[PDB]
Each structure stands twice: as C-alpha cells, then as structure tokens.
Design a protein around this ligand. Sequence first.
Ligand SMILES: Nc1ncnc2c1ncn2[C@@H]1O[C@H](CO)[C@@H](O)[C@H]1O
Ligand SMILES: [Cl-]
Length: 284
Amino acid sequence: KKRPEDFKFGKILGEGSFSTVVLARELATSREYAIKILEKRHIIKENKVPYVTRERDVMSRLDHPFFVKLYFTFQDDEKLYFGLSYAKNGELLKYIRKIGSFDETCTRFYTAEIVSALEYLHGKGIIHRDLKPENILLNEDMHIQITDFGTAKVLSPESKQARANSFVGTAQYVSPELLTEKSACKSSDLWALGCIIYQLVAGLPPFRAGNEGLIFAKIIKLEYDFPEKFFPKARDLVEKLLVLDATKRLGCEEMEGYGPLKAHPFFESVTWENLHQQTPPKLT
Ligand SMILES: Nc1ncnc2c1ncn2[C@@H]1O[C@H](CO)[C@@H](O)[C@H]1O
Ligand SMILES: [Cl-]
C-alpha cells in the first residue's frame, strides 16, 4: 500500500472544484503518474463521496489503451490519492482552440479513436455521461486518454438496465433525453460524440450560448446549422448522431451497435485494428 512519502511531487497539472492533480514520480520505480488528490473533509462536507467512489469503481474496470488508467489508490488522515496515468499532452480542447479546425484526416483519426473507446465502454455497460474535449486527454504519442469517470454509470447487467437517472453532464454536450425525460442511456454518449465531431470541424460545438438555459432550449429543438464548408461525409455522420430520438442514433443498441457506425463512409479508410499503435496524423 503506497503512501505520500513514496512519491516526489512536481508541478500541478490541474485543479478541479474538489481536487488537485499533481505530477509525481514514484521513488522506488521512477515511474511518473498524475496523482489526483482530494481533501476528505471537503468531499464529505460537500456530499461528493458518491462521485469519488464512482470514479474508483468505474476506472478499476477499464483496461483499454484509450482511457486514463487508475493504477492505485491510497489515503492518509486528510487526503485521498488516485494514481493515474500521465497524459503528457493535456486536453484535446487545447488543440481545437489553437488550431481552430482539424483537417479531415485528423478529424477522422481522432473521431475513430473516440468511437473505439465508446465501443469498449458501452460493451462493458458503462455510460460516460460527460464526454467532451476537456475530458479527452492526449498521451505523449498523441493518442487519446479519456478521463473523468466520477459522473459515469455502470448499468446493472442483472436488471438489463438501459437508463440512468442521475442528472450529470455539461450543458453543451448534454443529451435531449436527459433534459426532457430525466434519464440518460448509452446513446447519450453518441449525442456527445456528434457534438464533438462537429466541434473538431467547425471550431465550436453546435449548441452554444452564454447561458445554460439557452443551450437547453436549442438542444431540445435540434436548433443548429452547419458552416458552409464542412466535410460532406462528416456532416452526414453528425446528422446521424444528433438525432432527438436516442434509439435512432447510429451506434446505439436499437440500431445494432458499433458495426454500422464503424461502417459509415466517413470511416472508409480507417483500419480499426491496432488503432492505438498507428502513428497519429500531425495536427496543423
Ligand atoms: N491523467 C492526467 N494526466 C494529465 N493531466 C491530467 C490528468 N488528469 C487530469 N489532468 C488535468 O487536470 C485537470 C483537472 O482534473 C484536467 O482538466 C486536466 O487538464
Ligand atoms: Cl477553449
């Protein structure tokens, strides 16, 4: 069982409302980790214990190359520590902001990685519920590392559960069913995927406003438009994801899952096997 003194801490990598992520080196192994550190008094006082427990439980189930890995947890009297893989290149969002708009090859490659990751997650009966570029990190090789599982949901196989009732997410990416029916499903992540693909090409997500309520109003009306130049096959894909009826989104269980989604013409040139070993295209 590891202890804080087993590590040398370096720079702060980021701060959440209830956490601090610090780069660390484990002394006995020289391995680098991103350690997420939570102050127990704070999580207790602010009723965050279920989210911390959820993050550990969900991440403990994942072993796929496109996710941040949870290697260990420990605690001392004041803090809880999650030892995570270090995604050296940070948030996908950073690259969208700086470049403005990904070319078609880069859009296709990163979309394909996200699709592969969602296929794995949904095959385990897990809904992410907060998929967005800030939560898609990049490792040293520029492969994706999806993170932020405190708001994810393990659907129960015993009850063949399909819907989740907690109200979580981020306004720009939240699904219409969560807003109108008050539940999410695996397909809710496919709505977020559609928003992300749109954002990679257009530079901004499709439902956008300076107030969350204004965004909700547009989501539920499917009020969005495409910029005049938008890769046609990518537009077709987005139009097959941003569908109000969650049972009609390409990739969802009612549409027979990931096979038909991976068969979409936008992905004709993708080699799905060993995608995590392919050299990503350079982002320019
Ligand atoms: N495993 C990680 N590797 C690198 N940076 C991270 C990691 N986890 C979180 N962060 C950074 O810290 C912030 C707060 O969690 C994130 O938005 C991200 O920028
Ligand atoms: Cl930004």
